[PDB]
């Protein structure tokens, strides 16, 4: 594990807090910025579980290294630094205090699809929902432009910051989110990520619903081949349901791109009432 001074942070610049769910902990980093040396930033740190094979370590390393190459964007979870010298590898990334997108949305369901949360939050407006989809699209547009195929895009892999910024997670290395050509043929592409994003949109406008409710895996296989598709969510526009349907085109070349989706979500956002 050789040092990389672009990213290295001395171990003692990091007070490790509580677990987040190898494993990830909340932490405070001191002087993450060279020009703000007496500031503490809240961050998430990944490290290996107490028992962990040689593959675990190399996958962590790959992920970190892959994160380096991909660079920065506000709508992905960004690399902030790493501790590689004085002991166990720690990888330091941005922290999302408001949870993954599925829990965030579920917590914002009206109080009487139930609200699982014992700490419920204010319901989201129509405009907020579309804006959430837009940001996720931008995150994926950025990753796509960097030739990164996510392979497991889902609301569970979008995280929300204190300032309600959506950030794609785990982009660096479940069947109900896979496109058929991925499901059936292990063919993963930007187009199959687009299909997954159709499902993520459905997750959004159901406020974190479960896709294909009551459909067992064995069935789903056939049903997709049969051209089955999820019904519109009760509280979703026709425009946004056609978008989902297009993301779910059987012919992958005929799915829109993330670029295209960003342009459409951009327009739909601006037309969506902020009264609703």
Query: In this complex, which beta carbon is closest to ligand YY5, that of residue 159 or of residue 178?
Result: 159
d(CA 75, CA 118): 28
d(CA 106, CA 205): 11
- Please identify which of the residues 33, 59, 152, 246 carries the catalytic annotation: 152
Query: In this complex, which beta carbon is closest to ligand YY5, that of residue 3 or of residue 276?
Result: 3
170 is in an annotated binding site: yes
Query: In this complex, which beta carbon is closest to ligand YY5, that of residue 119 or of residue 274?
Result: 119
| 152 in active site | yes
Tell me how far CA of residue 12 lies from CA of 3, 7, 80, 83, 84, in angstroms: 16, 15, 16, 10, 12
Query: In this complex, which beta carbon is closest to ligand YY5, that of residue 25 or of residue 129?
Result: 25
Output the smallest distance, CB 20 to ligand YY5, in A: 4
Q: 199 phi and psi, to 5 degrees?
A: -70, -40
95 is in an annotated binding site: yes
Q: Which tokens belong to 88?
A: 């166990």
What 3-state class would DSSP assign to 26?
strand
Neighbouring CB atoms inside 10 A of 257's CB total 14
Query: In this complex, which beta carbon is closest to ligand YY5, that of residue 76 or of residue 240?
Result: 76
Q: Which tokens belong to 251?
A: 């012919």
Q: Which residue sits closest to ligand YY5, CB atoms considered?
A: 169
Output the smallest distance, CB 210 to ligand YY5, in A: 16
Output the smallest distance, CB 94 to ligand YY5, in A: 6
259 is in an annotated binding site: no
Neighbouring CB atoms inside 10 A of 234's CB total 9
100 is in an annotated binding site: yes
DSSP letter at 42 equals: E
241 is in an annotated binding site: no
Please count the CA atoms within 13 angstroms of the CA of 10 that sit on its side-chain side: 6
90 is in an annotated binding site: no
Output the smallest distance, CB 17 to ligand YY5, in A: 12
Tell me how far CA of residue 213 lies from CA of 109, 139, 176, in angstroms: 18, 27, 10
Contacting residues toward ligand YY5, per CB under 6 A: 20-21, 24, 44, 46, 63, 77, 91, 93, 95-96, 99-100, 103, 159, 169-172
Q: 66 phi and psi, to 5 degrees?
A: -65, -40
Output the smallest distance, CB 46 to ligand YY5, in A: 4
Q: Residue for token digits 């506000």?
A: 74
Structural contact between residues 180 and 116, judged by C-beta atoms closer than 8 angstroms: no
Catalytic sites, residue numbers? 152
Annotated binding site for ATP: 20-22, 46, 94-96, 100, 156, 170
- Binding positions are 20-22, 46, 94-96, 100, 156, 170
């Amino acid at each position: 594990l050789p040092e990389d001074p672009r990213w290295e942070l001395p171990r003692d610049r990091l007070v490790l807090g509580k677990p987040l769910g190898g494993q990830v902990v909340l932490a405070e980093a001191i002087g993450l910025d060279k020009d703000k040396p007496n500031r503490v930033t809240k961050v998430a740190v990944k490290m290996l579980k107490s028992d962990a094979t040689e593959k675990d370590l190399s996958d962590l390393i790959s992920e970190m290294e892959m994160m380096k190459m991909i660079g920065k964007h506000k709508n992905i979870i960004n690399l902030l630094g790493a501790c590689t010298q004085d002991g166990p590898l720690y990888v330091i990334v941005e922290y999302a205090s408001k949870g993954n997108l599925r829990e965030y949305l579920q917590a914002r369901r009206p109080p009487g699809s139930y609200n699982p949360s014992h700490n419920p939050e204010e319901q989201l407006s129509s405009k907020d929902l579309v804006s959430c989809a837009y940001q996720v699209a931008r995150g994926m547009e950025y990753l796509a432009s960097k030739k990164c195929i996510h392979r497991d895009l889902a609301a569970r892999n979008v995280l929300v910051t204190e300032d309600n910024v959506m950030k794609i997670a785990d982009f660096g290395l479940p069947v109900k989110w896979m496109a058929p050509e991925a499901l059936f043929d292990r063919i993963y592409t930007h187009q199959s990520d687009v299909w997954s994003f159709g499902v993520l949109l459905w997750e959004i406008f159901t406020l974190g619903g479960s896709p294909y409710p009551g459909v067992p895996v064995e069935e789903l296989f056939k049903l997709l081949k049969e051209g089955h598709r999820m019904d519109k969510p009760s509280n979703c526009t026709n425009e946004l349901y056609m978008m989902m349907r297009d993301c779910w085109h059987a012919v992958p070349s005929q799915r829109p791109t993330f670029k295209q989706l960003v342009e459409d979500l951009d327009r739909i956002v601006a037309l969506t009432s902020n009264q609703e």
